[PDB]
Amino acid sequence: LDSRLPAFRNLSPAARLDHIGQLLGLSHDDVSLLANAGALPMDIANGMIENVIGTFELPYAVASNFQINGRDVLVPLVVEEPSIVAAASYMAKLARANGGFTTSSSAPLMHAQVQIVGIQDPLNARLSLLRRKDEIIELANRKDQLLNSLGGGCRDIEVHTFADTPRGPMLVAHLIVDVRDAMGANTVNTMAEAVAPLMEAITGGQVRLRILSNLADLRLARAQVRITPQQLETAEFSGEAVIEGILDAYAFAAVDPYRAATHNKGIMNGIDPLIVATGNDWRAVEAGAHAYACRSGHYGSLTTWEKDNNGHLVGTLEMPMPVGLVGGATKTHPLAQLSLRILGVKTAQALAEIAVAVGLAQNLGAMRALATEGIQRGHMALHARNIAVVAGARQLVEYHDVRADRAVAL
Amino acid sequence: LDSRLPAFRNLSPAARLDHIGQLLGLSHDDVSLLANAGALPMDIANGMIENVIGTFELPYAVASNFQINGRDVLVPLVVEEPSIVAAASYMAKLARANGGFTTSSSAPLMHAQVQIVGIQDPLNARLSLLRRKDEIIELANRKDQLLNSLGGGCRDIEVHTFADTPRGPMLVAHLIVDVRDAMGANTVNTMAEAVAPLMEAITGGQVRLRILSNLADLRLARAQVRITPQQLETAEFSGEAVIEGILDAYAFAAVDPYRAATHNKGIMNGIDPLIVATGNDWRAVEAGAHAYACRSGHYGSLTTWEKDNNGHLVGTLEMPMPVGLVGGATKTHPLAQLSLRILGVKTAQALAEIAVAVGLAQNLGAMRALATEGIQ
Ligand SMILES: CC(C)(COP(=O)(O)OP(=O)(O)OC[C@H]1O[C@@H](n2cnc3c(N)ncnc32)[C@H](O)[C@@H]1OP(=O)(O)O)[C@@H](O)C(=O)NCCC(=O)NCCS[C@@H](S)C[C@@](C)(O)CC(=O)O
Ligand SMILES: NC(=O)c1ccc[n+]([C@@H]2O[C@H](COP(=O)([O-])OP(=O)(O)OC[C@H]3O[C@@H](n4cnc5c(N)ncnc54)[C@H](O)[C@@H]3O)[C@@H](O)[C@H]2O)c1
Numbered sequence: 036l037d038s039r040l041p042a043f044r045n046l047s048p049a050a051r052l053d054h055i056g057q058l059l060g061l062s063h064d065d066v067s068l069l070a071n072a073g074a075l076p077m078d079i080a081n082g083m084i085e086n087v088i089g090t091f092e093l094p095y096a097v098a099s100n101f102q103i104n105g106r107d108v109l110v111p112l113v114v115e116e117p118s119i120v121a122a123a124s125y126m127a128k129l130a131r132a133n134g135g136f137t138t139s140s141s142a143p144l145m146h147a148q149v150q151i152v153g154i155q156d157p158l159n160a161r162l163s164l165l166r167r168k169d170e171i172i173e174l175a176n177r178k179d180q181l182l183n184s185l186g187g188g189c190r191d192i193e194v195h196t197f198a199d200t201p202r203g204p205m206l207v208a209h210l211i212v213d214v215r216d217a218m219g220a221n222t223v224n225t226m227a228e229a230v231a232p233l234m235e236a237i238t239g240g241q242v243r244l245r246i247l248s249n250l251a252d253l254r255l256a257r258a259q260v261r262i263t264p265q266q267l268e269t270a271e272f273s274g275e276a277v278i279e280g281i282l283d284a285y286a287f288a289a290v291d292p293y294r295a296a297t298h299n300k301g302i303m304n305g306i307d308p309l310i311v312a313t314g315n316d317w318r319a320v321e322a323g324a325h326a327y328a329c330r331s332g333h334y335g336s337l338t339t340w341e342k343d344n345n346g347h348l349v350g351t352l353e354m355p356m357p358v359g360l361v362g363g364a365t366k367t368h369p370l371a372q373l374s375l376r377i378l379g380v381k382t383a384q385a386l387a388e389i390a391v392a393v394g395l396a397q398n399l400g401a402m403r404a405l406a407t408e409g410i411q412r413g414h415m416a417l418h419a420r421n422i423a424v425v426a427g428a429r430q431l432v433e434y435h436d437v438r439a440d441r442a443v444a445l
Numbered sequence: 446l447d448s449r450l451p452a453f454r455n456l457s458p459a460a461r462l463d464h465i466g467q468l469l470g471l472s473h474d475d476v477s478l479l480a481n482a483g484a485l486p487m488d489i490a491n492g493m494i495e496n497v498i499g500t501f502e503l504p505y506a507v508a509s510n511f512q513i514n515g516r517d518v519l520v521p522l523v524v525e526e527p528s529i530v531a532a533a534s535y536m537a538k539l540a541r542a543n544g545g546f547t548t549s550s551s552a553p554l555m556h557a558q559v560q561i562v563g564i565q566d567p568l569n570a571r572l573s574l575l576r577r578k579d580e581i582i583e584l585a586n587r588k589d590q591l592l593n594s595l596g597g598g599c600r601d602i603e604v605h606t607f608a609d610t611p612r613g614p615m616l617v618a619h620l621i622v623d624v625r626d627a628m629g630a631n632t633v634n635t636m637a638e639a640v641a642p643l644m645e646a647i648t649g650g651q652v653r654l655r656i657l658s659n660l661a662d663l664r665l666a667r668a669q670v671r672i673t674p675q676q677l678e679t680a681e682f683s684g685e686a687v688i689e690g691i692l693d694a695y696a697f698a699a700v701d702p703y704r705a706a707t708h709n710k711g712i713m714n715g716i717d718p719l720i721v722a723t724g725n726d727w728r729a730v731e732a733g734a735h736a737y738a739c740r741s742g743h744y745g746s747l748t749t750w751e752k753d754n755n756g757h758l759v760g761t762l763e764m765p766m767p768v769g770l771v772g773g774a775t776k777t778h779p780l781a782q783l784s785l786r787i788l789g790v791k792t793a794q795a796l797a798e799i800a801v802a803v804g805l806a807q808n809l810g811a812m813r814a815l816a817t818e819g820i821q
């Protein structure tokens with residue numbers, strides 16, 4: 036497959052869809068799911084959440100140029116904000132010239148928390164649990180034989196203590212569970228419930244919360260990118276100057292949480308729409324992302340940006356990325372299934388790797404604009420329709436002055 | 446308005462929609478938006494983002510029972526995950542018996558950062574910049590006379606310095622901007638780019654980033670809720686015991702970031718679907734939320750949970766909440782406009798207050814379920 040998508044930006048939605056259909060060999064019925072509204076039937080929507088009165092659409096787009104470990108990939112994105120898809124496609128275009136994005140991921144390990152209270156000896160109780168960890172792990176795995184046959188299952192436990200809280204001593208056991216192609220929530224919650232009575236017997240305490248942690252720091256996905264100065268040169272700025280500016284932007288994010296929040300928001304502009312497109316839980320991914328960003332005791336940047344020994348700009352993104360191909364609404368939504376088909380992913384960790392490549396590209400796009408002509412020239416041009424509506428035209432403002440004041444005057 | 450919506454959970458989507466239309470007096474055209482698929486025309490969708498090939502639906506629901514400062518409100522939500530809408534609705538029902546949710550909010554103030562590098566005397570330059578803030582403020586306000594005519598605009602400047610970075614000292618000016626009924630990002634970004642040359646002239650450095658901060662801690666929204674023990678009694682547990690269990694769950698979130706992340710995730714389960722329903726940017730709300738949670742250098746709980754002197758469970762949520770009634774895609778999407786119609790909100794800060802009430806309710810519902818589940 037070739038993901039360059041020639042002239043995609045200027046094709047109609049229908050023509051874009053036909054091209055995508057041809058590249059992938061989509062059936063007429065697959066294409067019909069995007070060519071017509073209503074792919075999520077009301078009986079499905081009504082069964083997904085409560086008090087349903089209809090459905091709500093967001094645009095479904097495809098970012099171009101992405102390449103993951105040498106293979107071209109098409110990336111579906113669902114979001115309401117302009118310039119995101121364009122920026123991601125642009126930075127992916129640049130990345131192609133230098134090998135695309137290089138990615139990897141850890142095993143899909145999730146934490147299941149079991150909170151224990153009502154004991155005066157939590158530090159001792161912790162050792163009692165660790166002494167009998169095999170028995171606990173076996174009980175957890177008895178509860179899900181299928182997962183174990185699929186190559187997943189509870190691998191280990193860790194135990195943490197909070198002996199002095201304002202509500203008294205607490206002990207917290209974590210089951211560490213390989214959840215294969217699931218996000219993992221229902222899978223691990225069931226194991227936490229199963230081990231609870233055994234943990235009460237071992238410790239003499241009372242189990243309270245049995246629940247996954249969204250701080251999924253053992254389920255990491257990683258992306259790398261490289262950009263050369265010749266690629267970043269503009270009429271106003273040398274490529275070398277742009278790279279230095281991007282490093283200045285990165286250091287700013289690393290020291291100031293007011294910047295880091297926005298910097299990381301820019302990453303999630305790329306990631307969350309891929310999560311939505313695949314029927315996955317975007318709140319979970321957001322919580323894992325931002326909590327991980329403060330793991331040091333300072334809220335910093337999820338990405339890294341440096342200059343290598345050849346003067347090239349090199350970036351990384353390593354972060355928690357709990358996603359599924361099964362579970363939740365990933366199988367329920369016909370377009371979630373179509374998105375997975377478009378992506379070509381065969382494991383959840385493969386989707387996770389695409390997600391961090393997109394987030395890395397997204398961050399790069401923001402920083403490149405910010406370090407050069409500023410964010411407004413390119414972004415507001417694609418927002419110009421919205422400005423015309425707010426004012427009460429779009430082509431005229433595209434003369435580099437997209438402001439409501441100007442729209443009012445015209 | 447009466448938001449109780451008796452029997453709502455068991456009615457058909459069509460009957461639910463009818464009951465909503467009656468209560469609000471929705472027009473025929475408004476009801477027709479939700480009745481037939483494809484409310485976002487492709488012409489509109491194709492203009493909103495790039496490389497569009499279609500649209501993607503999520504369920505559109507209404508939470509019941511919410512009451513904000515004594516006034517009943519209906520809350521539209523767009524999300525894929527079960528239990529959220531029911532939990533919000535049920536906790537809202539319990540809240541009604543004790544006066545509903547009480548809310549307040551700050552003015553709609555947003556930060557715009559201007560980063561300046563290569564200054565030899567950044568601490569001195571900061572005072573030089575501050576001394577001339579009125580000029581800078583005036584210059585910023587020239588870019589948006591419409592905003593100023595409506596009572597918004599740049600109000601002040603603050604300046605921060607970072608002495609220790611690997612790339613040298615940095616001066617960071619913040620424009621403080623009242624953005625009225627907009628979320629404000631594009632608004633303040635234009636101002637930041639507009640004042641940068643003048644700042645550069647005053648400080649002698651090189652301007653780099655000109656960009657809003659998503660850590661919108663001058664745009665706070667607040668909610669309170671109260672629940673009595675009698676409301677929380679179950680077959681297995683006294684209401685008093687459940688309250689103690691909820692306080693234990695809260696303390697767990699306050700000390701352990703592994704729990705806090707999940708706890709806060711539950712809050713955003715309530716908030717983000719309202720943000721989506723009103724055509725607002727949910728990445729901005731998420732970033733402000735989680736960054737605010739760790740402003741102390743420890744990632745903790747956004748909510749608080751306490752027992753008052755009468756033994757009642759009392760909860761708070763104070764957090765950044767940048768949202769708009771105008772701007773972004775809020776006017777462009779027909780269902781975003783319908784959502785705003787259903788809500789009845791007249792200002793962006795009113796929408797922000799409803800958002801935190803819904804987040805608070807969702808957290809309560811999540812904790813209540815976890816605190817009352819029997820050991821198997
Ligand atoms: C791309 C761009 C918008 C325009 O690009 P230029 O005019 O400078 O350059 P051109 O030579 O015309 O195109 C180069 C390539 O870009 C593709 N492309 C361009 N237009 C496209 C379109 N309409 N449709 C589809 N694709 C489009 C296409 O692949 C094209 O290749 P080809 O056609 O030559 O094959 C450019 O300006 C940009 O990336 N801005 C950053 C925006 C951002 O970060 N937004 C996040 C939200 S903002 C906020 S929310 C994020 C943030 C800033 O707050 C985050 C933070 O603070 O860190
Ligand atoms: N990191 C981020 O959060 C970030 C960064 C850049 C852009 N954005 C995007 O910015 C957009 C929101 O920008 P915005 O809120 O400035 O909207 P906007 O730019 O679409 O419109 C704002 C304009 O609306 C006009 N206006 C008319 N009536 C008004 C009223 N009653 N109150 C206030 N303004 C009024 C003003 O002149 C103002 O300049 C979103 O699409 C968001 O996704 C977000």
Ligand SMILES: C[C@@](O)(CCS)CC(=O)O
Pocket residue numbers: 246526707708709710711714811812
């Ligand atoms: C139940 C919860 O995980 C939401 C499920 S999406 C939130 C929490 O644990 O407080």
